């Protein structure tokens, strides 16, 4: 159909949707909002947040709800209902952590304090658990890629911008990034996407 993605000019919370469109070879409009235009756009959206995805005029919201929609009936979702649950759960574990960062906090001293606590004290526990769950499997679920693996590439890319040595203990998690990035459609998207900090 006709797809229009609306987000800021960032990877951020839209990037999972962008990976899925690339992987499934689905054409879409990648509409990027400049910051100064956001007050104009915000009241037009159902819950006042981005990303949203318009599908033939119907506006969907919530990045992970949308990602899950786009992967319905594909192997990327998980091949069984139990595996779909495992995929969903890894995604929400990652998203829970990323959602703790006070990205819009105005007080920079409090913002940095929270970022530091998250990156220094809390992140090692997440990483240990992700690495234990992955084990020596090829991908999070087993022997095939799912959108949870995509979400790890995306989240880790941003965490690495914030803390460049983040993955220094976990080469299996690095190998997982490398495997996702080597998928030809993903590799091509990474080469062509706008270079933004976040």
What amino acid positions are annotated as catalytic residues?
7, 13, 103
User: Phi then psi for 52, rounded to 5 degrees?
Assistant: -125, 155
Per-residue interface string for the shown chain with a second copy, residues 107-126, x marking contact by CB under 8 A: ------------------x-
Q: Among 50, 90, 91, 186, which residue sits at the site for ligand GSH (rule: CB under 6 A)?
A: 50
How many angstroms separate the CA atoms of 140 and 130, rounded? 9
Selected binder of a second copy within 30, 54, 88, 105 (CB under 8 A): 88
Is residue 63 a contact residue for ligand GSH (CB under 6 A)?
yes
> Which candidate, 94, 71, 76, places its Cα nearest to that of 144?
76
Cα 80 to chain centroid distance, Å, stands at 22
The one of ligand GSH, a second copy, none whose footprint includes residue 13, by CB under 5 to 8 A per kind, is ligand GSH
- Could you tell me the two tokens for 135? 């084990």
3-class DSSP state for residue 29?
strand
3-8 vs 29-33, strand pairing mode = parallel
Q: Tell me if 13 contacts ligand GSH by CB under 6 A.
A: yes
Is 69 marked as binding a ligand?
no
**Site of interaction with ligand GSH (CB under 6 A):** 12-13, 42, 49-51, 62-64, 92, 96
């Amino acid at each position: 159909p006709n797809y229009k993605l609306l987000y800021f000019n960032m990877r951020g919370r839209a990037e999972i949707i962008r990976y899925i469109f690339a992987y499934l070879d689905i054409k879409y409009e990648d509409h990027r909002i400049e910051q100064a235009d956001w007050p104009k756009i915000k009241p037009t959206l159902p819950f006042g947040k981005i990303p949203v995805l318009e599908v033939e005029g119907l506006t969907l919201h919530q990045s992970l709800a949308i990602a899950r929609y786009l992967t319905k009936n594909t192997d990327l979702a998980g091949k069984t209902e139990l595996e779909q649950c495992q995929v969903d759960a890894v995604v929400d574990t990652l998203d829970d952590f990323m959602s703790l960062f006070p990205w819009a906090e105005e007080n920079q001293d409090l913002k940095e304090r929270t970022f530091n606590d998250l990156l220094t004290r809390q992140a090692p526990h997440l990483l240990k658990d992700l690495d234990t769950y992955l084990g020596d499997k090829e991908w999070f679920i087993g022997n095939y890629v799912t959108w949870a693996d995509f979400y790890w590439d995306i989240c880790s890319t941003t965490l690495l911008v914030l803390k460049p040595d983040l993955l220094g203990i976990y080469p299996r998690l690095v190998s997982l990034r490398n495997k996702v990035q080597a998928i030809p459609a993903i590799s091509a998207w990474i080469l062509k996407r706008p270079q933004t900090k976040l």
